[PDB]
């Protein structure tokens, strides 16, 4: 097919949308002022919390045909070698 691409236009639109999205998700009418922000690096508790939230933790098109297969009845070797005890049921 023919195409209308300009990579820089898409990049700029994406960046503007990102600005709007980050401001909107925090429900911020305008970015906060930084005048009364204490200087220096963040408190170590805040950095620990940010590290904890930042890291990672171990915790087809085409149609298909359906088929059905029943289990082998209990008439042969089902109850012979595995009785249906109150503990469990076998299939």
């Amino acid at each position: 097919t023919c195409k209308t691409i300009d990579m820089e236009l898409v990049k700029r639109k994406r960046i503007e949308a990102i600005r709007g999205q980050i401001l909107s998700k925090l429900r911020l009418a305008s970015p906060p002022s930084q005048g009364e922000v204490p200087p220096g690096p963040l408190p170590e508790a805040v950095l620990a919390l940010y590290n904890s939230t930042r890291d990672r933790v171990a915790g087809d098109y085409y149609a298909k045909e359906v088929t059905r297969v029943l289990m082998v009845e209990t008439h042969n070797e089902i109850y012979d070698k595995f009785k249906q005890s109150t503990h469990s049921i076998y299939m």
Binding site: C2, K3, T4, D6, L9, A29
Partner: protein, 532 residues
């Protein structure tokens, strides 16, 4: 605050309240960039004769209902970059005579202005840009029959009711850029002359039928939208501009006065026969990046006034340019395409072609009227009106003796042509006209040129080559700049570089395998005139 004759230019910062000790003899007042939180009626009403009140960049949020009403002569009022959205009632009182009201970037809201804006019987330029407006209903704009320039870019306008512009009988310049409109059903703004619907999300465009009043639109902008069709333009007979770049338009005398049409980055996969017929009086056309497979302006008398044609980056295979069709085409661009075989006299029939860019098309010229060349060639010889021609990245295997014999062009480029083998006397008929030459990156080894005869030559470009030797200079030619970077020269004779002291201003050697204690003349030339 700084005080001159009838001007109080308050400084850029450090103010929290309007000064009260200054005399009312001033006529122009500025309060931009300060930290004013609200405007009280008492200190402001003290000043009577004011003609400028620049209240930009403050923290204004609450206004006395009669604050601005007492100022008889107020002729300008800028409230850009404030906090009016936090407001209370009345807002701006009925302004006696104001010809410029600026409310940009106040985070305004639909229905806030109708309770804030008052009748201004002499308003002439309204600006609501960078606000947060969302609708234009019949009651949004009222009681201002003198409005002539409305600015509405960067809002969130998504819907416009029927008669939102009924109360502005003399609107001429309208601006709806960067908004969020999505469709336009008709057009009932007769006097409008500059319409800017750029950077919207429009999907279709339409006008009205049965025109009782002749629409007068001339300037129209529709770039960056998502149009899927070429709009009907029989209702805008005075249109002299159009910009449909980056749309999705696919083509399947209403424009008897169209003057500048731009149609680039669309999906124009082919051009219909009747589309070019009605577009008379055109002067600039841009079909760049559109996927045109062929250009077929065969009919005689088509585009009689065309002065430029950009067909770059289309993947054209063929040109069907007839004779005496584009009698005024001065600039033509064809770069990026892949043109293999054309009739020899395709570019010859053009009456006043001046610039013909053919970068990357793989078009190889042929010998001339005598000593003919291979089939499928292109005749660059018989064009007496050419002035510029770029032939880079065309993989010209072999050059011909008379490929440029009757083309008194002042600029020729042949760079980025690996394996180029230049025939003797190839630049024959260009000695007295050609002014700039370029052969950078060819990879040729020997420069067998009539260099001393190129009296009008100004600059030369031979970098990234394997040049071995150059004919000995016999005079101080007018050549001003010479490039020899990444060359094979390691020791430069001085007698062979005869002259090159008066006119020469830059002769590059950087990146060459030059060796110290072997040049001599280079040490003299480096001292005065050129460095490295």
């Amino acid at each position: 605050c700084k005080m001159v004759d009838k001007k109080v230019s308050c400084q850029v910062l450090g103010l929290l309240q309007v000064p009260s000790v200054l005399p009312p003899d001033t006529e122009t007042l500025d309060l931009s960039g300060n930290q004013l939180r609200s405007i009280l009626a008492s200190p402001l009403g003290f000043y009577t004769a004011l003609r400028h009140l620049d209240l930009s960049t403050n923290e204004i949020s609450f206004l006395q209902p009669g604050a601005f009403q007492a100022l008889t002569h107020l002729e300008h009022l800028s409230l850009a970059h404030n906090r009016l959205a936090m407001a209370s009632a009345g807002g701006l009182g009925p302004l006696p005579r104001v010809t410029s009201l600026d409310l940009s970037g106040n985070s305004l809201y639909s229905g806030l202005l109708e309770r804030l804006l008052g009748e201004a019987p002499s308003l002439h330029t309204l600006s609501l840009a960078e606000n947060s407006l969302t609708r234009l209903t019949r009651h949004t704009f009222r009681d201002m029959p003198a409005l002539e320039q409305l600015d509405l870019h960067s809002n969130v306008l998504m819907d416009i009711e029927d008669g939102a512009f009924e109360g502005l009988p003399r609107l001429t310049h309208l601006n709806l850029s960067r908004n969020s409109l999505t469709c336009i059903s008709d057009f009932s703004l007769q006097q409008l002359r500059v319409l800017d619907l750029s950077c919207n999300s429009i999907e279709a465009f339409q006008t009205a039928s049965q025109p009782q009043a002749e629409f007068q639109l001339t300037w129209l902008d529709l770039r960056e939208n998502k149009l899927l069709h070429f709009p009907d333009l029989a209702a805008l007979p005075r249109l002299i501009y159009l910009n449909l770049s980056n749309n999705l338009i696919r083509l399947p005398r209403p424009l008897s006065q169209l003057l500048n049409l731009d149609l680039s980055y669309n999906e124009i996969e082919l051009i219909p026969d009747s589309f070019l017929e009605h577009l008379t009086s055109l002067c600039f056309l841009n079909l760049s990046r559109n996927c045109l497979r062929t250009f077929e302006a065969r009919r005689l008398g088509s585009l009689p006034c065309l002065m430029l044609l950009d067909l770059s980056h289309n993947a054209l295979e063929t040109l069907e340019l007839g004779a005496r069709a584009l009698g005024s085409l001065r600039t033509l661009l064809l770069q990026g395409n892949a043109l293999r075989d054309l009739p020899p006299y395709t570019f010859a029939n053009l009456a006043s072609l001046q610039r013909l860019n053919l970068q990357g098309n793989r078009v190889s010229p042929c010998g001339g009227p005598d000593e003919p060349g291979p089939s499928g060639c292109v005749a660059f010889s018989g064009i007496t009106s050419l002035r510029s021609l770029s032939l880079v990245d065309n993989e010209i295997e072999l050059l011909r003796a008379g490929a440029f014999l009757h083309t008194p062009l002042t600029e020729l480029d042949l760079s980025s042509n690996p394996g180029l083998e230049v025939a003797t006397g190839a630049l024959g008929g260009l000695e007295a006209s050609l002014e700039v030459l370029a052969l950078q990156g060819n990879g040729l080894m020997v420069l067998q040129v009539d260099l001393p005869c190129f009296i009008c030559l100004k600059r030369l470009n031979l970098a990234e080559n394997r040049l071995s030797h150059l004919p000995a200079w016999t005079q101080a030619v007018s050549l001003e700049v010479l490039d020899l970077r990444n060359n094979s020269f390691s020791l430069l004779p001085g007698s062979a570089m005869g002259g090159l002291e008066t006119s020469l201003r830059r002769l590059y050697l950087q990146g060459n395998p030059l060796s110290c204690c072997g040049n001599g003349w280079l040490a003299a030339q480096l001292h005065q005139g050129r460095v490295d």
